[PDB]
Symmetry: D2
Subunit: 388 residues, 4 copies
C-alpha cells in the first residue's frame, strides 16, 4: 500500500547527482553548491542506503594534504551520524583541462602517468571508507577525428593502465573490484569501449580478468539505440555485473540522466524484472541529474521518485511472474523449451536423428504461432495495474 524505501532496498546515489548545479553546454548553474554533508543527511532521510563519490566531489581539486583530511573527517562523521554506507567510489579523469585528450589513453605520456597516480590515491581512500567497487568511466578516452587516436595503441595503453591498477590492489591486499562504465559518445565524439559488449570483450584481455566487471548505465546503452535489459542479461551471463547505474533517457540524443522510470518506461520494467529474477545483490545506484528547472525542493522530489519508481516496478514485475495466467502463457510461448538443451544427447546423436532433418516436418513447425502478443499484453496489463 506504500512504496516507502528503506536502507534494506540498497538504494545509493552519487554526490554529483543531487549536487549537480545545473550547468549545461548552453547555460550557467541554476542551483548553489551543496555541502556533501548536507546531501548525506538529506538522502538518509529519504530512505537511501548509501552514497558514492568521485575524488573531486569530496576533495576539491588542488587540496593540500591537510584540507584533504579535513574534508574526509567531516564526511566520515556524517556517515557515522546517519548510518550511511559508501559502497562505490570513482575518479574524476574528465573535468580538469589536463584530461582534455583523456587520462589513461591521452596521447601525452606524462598525463597518462598522472592519471594513474590520481586514481591510485583515491583507491586507497575508497578502501578506507569501505567501498567494495571502484568504477572507471573513461569519459575523455576517444576522439573527434580519425587521425588523432590510433585505437590499437590506445587499447594497449588502456590495458596497461588497468593491469597496473590490478597489480596495485593485489599487492596492497585490498578487496575491491573494478567496474568499467561504457558510454558511446559525449563528451568525446566517439568514446573507447562504447557499449557493454566492448567493455566485456576488453576485460577478457586483461592480466587478471576476475578483478574487473562492468557498471552499465541505462541511458548510455540507449544512446546507441540498444536494448538495456538484453545487455544486462549478457553481463549477468558472463558473471560480470558488479554494479549498475539507474536513470532514464529518451532515445538517441545527448546524455539526459533523467530520474529512473522516466525515459523508456517499459525497458525499466523489464530491467527490474531481470535484476530481481536474477537475484542481483549489488547496490541500486542512481546516476541522474535533477533538471536545471528545479529548485532544491525539486531535487529531493526527483531523488525520491527514483526510488519510488523502482519499488512500483518491482511490485508489478513480481505480480507478473506470480500470475498463473502468465505462467501458462510462458509455456504456450515455449519459454520452458528455450531453457532445455538443444542437444544434450550429443553431436553424434544429433547427426543420426532423422527427426531433426530428413523427416522434420518444417511446414508444421512453421505454422505454430509463438503467442508472443498475448504474453506481451499480459505484461502490459500488469505494468499498468489493469488486471483484468
Amino acid at each position: 500500500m506504500n512504496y516507502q524505501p528503506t536502507p534494506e532496498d540498497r538504494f545509493t546515489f552519487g554526490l554529483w547527482t543531487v549536487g549537480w548545479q545545473g550547468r549545461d553546454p548552453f547555460g550557467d548553474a541554476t542551483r548553489r553548491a551543496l555541502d556533501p554533508v548536507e546531501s548525506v543527511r538529506r538522502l538518509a532521510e529519504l530512505g537511501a542506503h548509501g552514497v558514492t563519490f568521485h575524488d573531486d566531489d569530496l576533495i576539491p581539486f588542488g587540496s593540500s594534504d591537510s584540507e584533504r583530511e579535513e574534508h574526509v573527517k567531516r564526511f566520515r562523521q556524517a556517515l557515522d551520524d546517519t548510518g550511511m554506507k559508501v559502497p562505490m567510489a570513482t575518479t574524476n579523469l574528465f573535468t580538469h583541462p589536463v584530461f582534455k585528450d583523456g587520462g589513461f589513453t591521452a596521447n601525452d605520456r606524462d598525463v597518462r602517468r598522472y592519471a594513474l597516480r590520481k586514481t591510485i590515491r583515491n583507491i586507497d581512500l575508497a578502501v578506507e571508507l569501505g567501498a567494495e567497487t571502484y568504477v572507471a568511466w573513461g569519459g575523455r578516452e576517444g576522439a573527434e577525428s580519425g587521425g588523432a587516436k590510433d585505437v590499437r595503441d590506445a587499447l594497449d595503453r588502456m590495458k596497461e593502465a588497468f593491469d597496473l591498477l590490478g597489480e596495485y590492489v593485489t599487492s596492497q591486499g585490498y578487496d575491491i573490484r573494478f567496474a568499467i562504465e561504457p558510454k558511446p559518445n559525449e563528451p568525446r565524439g566517439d568514446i573507447l569501449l562504447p557499449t557493454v559488449g566492448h567493455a566485456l570483450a576488453f576485460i577478457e584481455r586483461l592480466e587478471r580478468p576476475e578483478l574487473y566487471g562492468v557498471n552499465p548505465e541505462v541511458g548510455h546503452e540507449q544512446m546507441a539505440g540498444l536494448n538495456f535489459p538484453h545487455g544486462i542479461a549478457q553481463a549477468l551471463w558472463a558473471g560480470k555485473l558488479f554494479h549498475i547505474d539507474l536513470n532514464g533517457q529518451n532515445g538517441i540524443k545527448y546524455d539526459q540522466d533523467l530520474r529512473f522510470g522516466a525515459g523508456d518506461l517499459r525497458a525499466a520494467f523489464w530491467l527490474v524484472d531481470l535484476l530481481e529474477s536474477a537475484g542481483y545483490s549489488g547496490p541500486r545506484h542512481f546516476d541522474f541529474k535533477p533538471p536545471r528547472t528545479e529548485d532544491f525542493d525539486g531535487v529531493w522530489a526527483s531523488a525520491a521518485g527514483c526510488m519510488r519508481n523502482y519499488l512500483i516496478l518491482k511490485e508489478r514485475a513480481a505480480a507478473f511472474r506470480a500470475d498463473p495466467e502468465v505462467q501458462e502463457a510462458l509455456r504456450a510461448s515455449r519459454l520452458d523449451e528455450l531453457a532445455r538443451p538443444t542437444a544434450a544427447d550429443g553431436l553424434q546423436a544429433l547427426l543420426d536423428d532423422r527427426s531433426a532433418f530428413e523427416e522434420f516436418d518444417v511446414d508444421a513447425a512453421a505454422a505454430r504461432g509463438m503467442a508472443f502478443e498475448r504474453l506481451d499484453q499480459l505484461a502490459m496489463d500488469h505494468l499498468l495495474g489493469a488486471r483484468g
Copy 2:
C-alpha cells in the same frame, strides 16, 4: 592513373548481392532472378576474385539430393571456367517461415536441432568448395517484446550451438574458422549480439575460442551510431578480424546496404587506412544491394563502383601516410607518444616518481594544444586530392 581491380585485390561478392531482385517491405521485385553461373561470369569480368553464398542462394530450399548435385556441378564448372574462388560461405537461417523466432535460439527445441543440421550440411559443402571462413548472421535471434525471450537462456542455447559446430569441424578435421556477424536490429526488434563488442565478448565463453572471430559489416555498426573503424581496431587488437563486409549506410535507420563508399565517406577512408596499415589479408567482401531503381546495367555499375571506391581510398590513405607533412603533424599531436608504454619502469617506480604527481605541472600540460584540427584538415585535403 587507372583504378582497375584485379583478382589480386581480393574483392569478393555474395551471390545475393548482385542477385537481389529488389523486394523490400513495401514493394515487389523489380529485377528478374539471376542464374548464379551468370553472376560468376559477370563478376569475373569486372575484376572480382571470388564469390560467397548462403546454402539457399545456390541450392533452392527443398531440393532433392540429385537436384542439389546438379546445382553444385554447374556452379563448380563456372568457377573452373573463370578462375573464381569461394573463400566464405554461410547458412540461410532467416528466410524460411520455420525460422521466424530464430534458428539457434528459437524457443522450439525441434527448430533449433533442425537449424544445426541445416548448418552442418552446408559446412561440408563449403569445405568441398574450398571456403576458409564460415559466417553466421543470426538475423532472427532476438525479440520484439521483453517476455518472449529469456536472454540468459538464449545465450546458453547460442553457445551450445556454436560449441557443437566447433566439435563437428574439429572431429572432421576441417580447416575452416567461424565468423559471427553482428547486427543490432532488423528483422527482429532487437537482435542478440548486436555489435562487434557483444560478439567478441561472447566468443570468449565458447569452448574453443580460437576457432571463432567476427565478420563486422560497415552498415550494421552504423545502425547503432557507432564508429566502424574503431570497432574494427578493437577486433584487430583482439586477433579476431577473420572477415569483413563492406558497404555504405546513411546513419541510424533501416539496413541500406549501399555500395561501398556511399554513406559515410570519411569513415570509409579511415577504415581503408586501418585495414591497409594493419596488413589485413582476408577478402574484401561486399555485402551490398544495388538499389531497386536499377536495371541490370545499373547492378553491374554499382558492383564496379564498390571496387573502384576501395581502390581510390586506398591510394588517398597511402598518400596521407607517406606525406612528410603528415608525419610531422602526427608527431606534433603526439601519436608517437601514444605508442610508448605508460609505465614500462613498473608500478613501484611509478609510485615513487614525484614527476608523475607531486611535482607534475598540470597547468602547463593542460595548456599544450593537441593540434588535431590541423592534422584532420591534412587528412581531408588528402582524401579530396586537394594538396596543397
Copy 3:
C-alpha cells in the same frame, strides 16, 4: 472495471494491418492471405467501428472492370451485415515496380500521369463507400542518392499533383478532404516531406490549402527521434489534424508498426491525454502489423490490444487531469500563466513598462523552481495506477 471497446469509440483498422502476411526484407510470409470480408467480420466482433483500405488491398492490381465490381459488392455486403463504416481510403503508389522512383514525383512523366489517374479512380470509389478522408503516403517519393532527384522540381511536381486532385474533387462536388502522411525514410533512403512540420509547411503552398491536412503516424515521427505529442499539438494548433495513425515504435530504426501502447508507453499516455483534451473527433486508426511470429489467434489478440491500451490510457489521463492534487501542481508550475497573453497591453505599453526590464529582478525570477519533477511524478503515479 472493463476496458471493452464499442463502435462508439471510433476505432478503425486498415485491411492491410491484420491482413499483413508477414513478408519482411529478409523472409517469406508466415500467414495465409485474409479475405477482406473475413477481416471486416472479425474486426466487427472485436468492437471496431470501421475499416480503411488502399485500392490494391480491396481490388487486386490488374483487375477487369467486372472483377472489380465483384470485389466491391462482396465488400459492401460485409459492411451492411456488420454495421462497419469506411471513414478513410488511400491509394497504393508504392508496391508495383512501376512506382520504384515514386508516383507523383517519379522522374518519368508518364508514370506521374498514371499515378494521378490511379488515384482519381480510387477517390471515386472512396466517396461511394462514404469515406470522408483520403490519405496520401508518398512512400516512394524520395531518393537514395543526391543527384537522382532535384528536390525543388520534385516539390513542384508534388504540388502540381495535389492541386490537380483538389481541382478534381471540387469539380465533382465531393466532400472529402486530403491528409498527407509523412515518414522520414524507408523504403527510400530519404522521403520527401519527412515530418509533420514539412507536410504542414508544404500544404500552405497548395492552391486550396483548406482541403488538405496531415495524417501523422506515431512510429514515423519517432523514426526521426521527435516528440510525437508535440508534433500533434502543432498540427492541432494549425487546424490540420484530419486523421491519425496509432501504433508503437522503439526508437530510431526500421518502421516497426507495433501495436498501439507498445514502443514508447509514456508518449502514448501524453498523446491520449492531448487527443482527449483537445476534443479530437476523428477516427482512432491503427496502422500496425501483428508480428510475423504470430498465427491468426495472435493477430486478433494484437488488434484487440491496440484498443485496450487506448482505453486504459484514456482512463489514466482522465484521472490525472481530474486529480485536485494535479490541478494544484499545474498551478505551482505556472501552466495557468503560460495560457495568459504575454502582452495583451500591447507593444507600447510593454516598451514603457519598467517592471519588464529596467526594474525586473532577474535573480529573484531565476531562483523560482518550476516544480516540474513533482508534477511528472504525479503523472507517472497516475499512469501506473499507483496513487498514492
Copy 4:
C-alpha cells in the same frame, strides 16, 4: 590552384565560435577568453567577410549603459579598421538562469516580457551596426517532461512574441528580417519547432509572414537523422532561406558543431552544389566550435578549414555540373523530365488521355532502369577528384 578565401566569398563567423572557451557538460574551459576586437582582427586576416554576435557576446550581461557604449565603440573601431561587416545578430535567451524554462514561451509571464525587452534592445543595436538579418534560436523553448508545457499554449505565446517583434520593426521602419533557427533537442529534452519543416509551417501563421524565414544549421537537422540538402531545397522552394549556419555533425548524438566539411562529407558536397546552383546570395556563416583539445593556433586552423572546405567543394560541384558526361547521365536518369509539368494540358485532358491509364504499358515503364548508380558514381569521382 589555390583555395584562398576573399571577403567576396561572404564567409562569416560568430564571435562565440572562435571564442568558445571549451566548457562542455563534463569539463572546464581549456582556453582563455578572446577579446572580440582580437577575433575580428584575426578573422579578417584569414579572409572572412564579417562577424555575427549575440548581445551577451559583445556586451557582458548586466552592463551599465556606459560600459555598453564603451564595448560597442571598441567593436565599431575594429570593424572600421578591418573592413569587416556585421550581417546578422541575435539575442542570448538561453545562458542566464532566468531563461531556464524558456524566454518567449517560459511559463512565467514576467520572464516572457523580459525576454521581449532584451530582444528589442538588441534589434536596435543590430540595425545600428548594419545587420540585415536577426536570428532567433529558441534553445530553451521546450520541455523534459510532458505535463510541464502545453504546446498549443506555448505556440500561442511564440506567435505572440514574433508578432510583437514584427510590429516593432515595422513601426520603427527598420529593414531587417527575422530568421528562426530550428534544433530538435539539447539543451531541452525536446525543443519547440524542432526542424526546418516545423519552423516554416509556424511562420505561415504569423501576422506578417513575409518578414520571417529560417536559418537552418547543418548539424541540427542531422540530429534528427534528416537530409539537410533536402530541407534546404524545401526552404528555397518556399522563398524562406534567409541565412544559413554551416558546420559538421556525425549523426544522431549531442550537437557537435564541428568545422564545415567534417561530419557527413557527401552531404556537404550536395549542399554546396544546391546553394551555388540556386544562386543563394546570403552569408556563408559558420556556427562551429573548435574542439577543446585545441590551443589558439588550432582555433585559427579550424576556422580556416571551414572556408577551405567550402571552396574545394564548390570547385568539385561546379566541375560535376559542367561535365558533359554528367549532363548526359542526368538526361539518362530523366532529371530533365522531372522538371517538366506532369499535366500542363489540364485535368480534363488528363482524364481523357487513354495513354495515361487504359493503354499505359505499366510493365514496360517498370522495366526501365533509372541509371542512378552510374550518376552517383560520377558524382563520387568528381568529389574525390578521380576523373577518370
